[PDB]
C-alpha cells in the first residue's frame, strides 16, 4: 500500500494506489483506499483491511451522530475519534490511518495515526509499505501552499515512485480533492504515471 495526504492552498488532497495483496497474490488490483467518513473528511487506510474498514465504519457512524446533534465536525474531531479507537484497541488492531479534511475556518488539515494510536498533525503525510521509498523524494519536493495542479503532480510523482519500488503497491492512482468548491475524484492509469 502507498497512501498520502497533502495540504495545499485551497485545501487538501488524498492519494492512494489500488493494490491489495494476499502474500504475493494481488487479491484486488482496483481497490478504493480513499474512504469517506464525512462529506469533507476522508481517510487513507493501511494495515489490516478488515481492521481499517471496521474502524472507518465506526468513525462514519460517530461523525453522523455527531452531525445530527452538534453540526459539522472538525477534522481534528474526526482524527480524535480515529485515535480513540486505534489507541484503546492497539493490542487487537493493525491499522495505519491518515485523516484528511477541509473546514472553511481551518481549511485543509492532515492527521496521521500510526500503529500505536498516536496522532500527528502534519502539512502532509505518507504511509503504507510503499511510503518508505519516497521519504527522500517527498521531503525534497513538498512545498507549502502549492496549487491544486502542483499538488496533484506531487502526489502523482510520489506514488508513482512508491508503486515502482514496492511490490505491495500498484494498479491505478486514486485521488480525492477536498476544497470549498466540493469533492472531486481523480484517477490516473499505469500508462500515464509509469512514464513520469
Amino acid at each position: 500500500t502507498s497512501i498520502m495526504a497533502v495540504t495545499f492552498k485551497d485545501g487538501v488532497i488524498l492519494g492512494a494506489d489500488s493494490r491489495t495483496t494476499t502474500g504475493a497474490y494481488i487479491a484486488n488490483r482496483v481497490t478504493d483506499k480513499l474512504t469517506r467518513v464525512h462529506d469533507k473528511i476522508w481517510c487513507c487506510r493501511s494495515g489490516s483491511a478488515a481492521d481499517t474498514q471496521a474502524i472507518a465504519d465506526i468513525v462514519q457512524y460517530h461523525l453522523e451522530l455527531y452531525t445530527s446533534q452538534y453540526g459539522t465536525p472538525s477534522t481534528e474531531t474526526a482524527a480524535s475519534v480515529f485515535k480513540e479507537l486505534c489507541y484503546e484497541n492497539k493490542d487487537n488492531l493493525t491499522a495505519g490511518i491518515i485523516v484528511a479534511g477541509y473546514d472553511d475556518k481551518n481549511k485543509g488539515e492532515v492527521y496521521t495515526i500510526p500503529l500505536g494510536g498516536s496522532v500527528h498533525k502534519l502539512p502532509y503525510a505518507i504511509a503504507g509499505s510503499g511510503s518508505t521509498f519516497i521519504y527522500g523524494y517527498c521531503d525534497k519536493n513538498f512545498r507549502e501552499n502549492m496549487s491544486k495542479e502542483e499538488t496533484v503532480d506531487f502526489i502523482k510523482h510520489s506514488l508513482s515512485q512508491a508503486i515502482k519500488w514496492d511490490g505491495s503497491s500498484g494498479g491505478v492512482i486514486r485521488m480525492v480533492v477536498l476544497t470549498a468548491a466540493g469533492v472531486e475524484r481523480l484517477i490516473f492509469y499505469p500508462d500515464e504515471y509509469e512514464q513520469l
Binding site: A27, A54, N92
Partner: protein
C-alpha cells in the same frame, strides 16, 4: 472450491463448482455451494463449509425479519454489512469466505467478503482454492457491458478452469442469475462435464454371501393399543 461472481448489463451472476473435500478425499461430489440469503440475494461460500452455511442462514434469517419489519425488499448492502460485522467480531475464527451478489430496489450488486471481515467491490470476483485459475479466465475474457448470456458463459468457463486445474475443485457447475426486475433463476448443475464412465463389472453379490449371526425385527412403532 472455485466460486465466481460476474456483473452484466442488467444484473449479476454467481457460479460455483460442486466438490467438497476432507483433505485429499472427496466427501460429496455434488455439493451445493450457492446459498440463498433472500429471494434475490444469493452468495457462494469457500472455506469452512459449516461456517459458510451457518453465517448465510443467520444473516438470511435476520434479513428476512428486517424485510418484514421495514416492509421493504432486502438490500445486498444490508446482507454485506451484517455479514462483515458478524465475521469481524469473530476475528477470522468463522472461516467464511463469501461472494455476495444480488438485485434490490437500488440496483444490482457484487461484493466479496473474507473471514476476517474485509469486503471488496468488483465487476468480476473469484474465491477459493481454484480462484487463481478462475481469475486467469476472468482477466482474459471480461469486458464492460456484458450481456446475460456472455456473463453466464464467462462465469461457468471460470469455474471450469477451477474444476480442471485445481484439485480442490471438481464435478459440476452451479449457476444463479439475478437480473433486475426478474425472479432470480437458480441453475443447479448448469454444466455436468464429469459423469463417471460405466464400470467394467457389476459388483452385485449373490444373496446369502454375507455370514449372519442373528436376525430380529426392530420396533419403530409406538406402544400399541389393547
Amino acid at each position: 472450491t472455485t466460486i465466481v461472481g460476474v456483473k452484466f448489463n442488467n444484473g449479476v451472476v454467481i457460479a460455483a463448482d460442486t466438490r467438497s473435500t476432507q483433505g485429499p478425499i472427496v466427501a460429496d461430489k455434488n455439493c451445493a455451494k450457492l446459498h440463498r440469503i433472500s429471494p434475490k440475494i444469493w452468495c457462494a461460500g469457500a472455506g469452512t463449509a459449516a461456517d459458510t452455511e451457518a453465517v448465510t442462514q443467520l444473516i438470511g434469517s435476520n434479513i428476512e425479519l428486517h424485510s418484514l419489519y421495514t416492509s421493504r425488499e432486502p438490500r445486498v448492502v444490508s446482507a454485506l454489512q451484517m455479514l462483515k460485522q458478524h465475521l469481524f467480531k469473530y476475528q477470522g475464527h468463522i472461516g467464511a469466505y463469501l461472494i455476495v451478489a444480488g438485485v434490490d430496489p437500488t440496483g444490482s450488486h457484487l461484493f466479496s467478503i473474507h473471514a476476517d471481515g474485509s469486503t471488496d467491490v468488483g465487476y468480476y470476483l473469484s474465491l477459493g482454492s481454484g480462484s487463481l485459475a478462475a481469475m486467469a479466465v476472468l482477466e482474459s475474457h471480461w469486458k464492460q457491458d456484458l450481456t446475460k448470456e456472455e456473463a453466464i458463459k464467462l462465469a461457468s468457463d471460470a469455474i471450469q478452469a477451477g474444476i480442471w486445474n485445481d484439485l480442490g475443485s471438481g464435478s459440476n457447475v452451479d449457476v444463479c442469475v439475478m437480473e433486475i426486475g426478474k425472479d432470480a433463476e437458480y441453475l443447479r448443475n448448469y454444466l455436468t462435464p464429469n459423469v463417471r464412465e460405466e464400470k467394467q463389472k457389476s459388483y452385485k453379490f449373490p444373496r446369502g454371501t454375507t455370514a449372519v449371526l442373528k436376525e430380529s425385527i426392530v420396533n419403530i412403532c409406538d406402544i400399541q393399543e389393547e
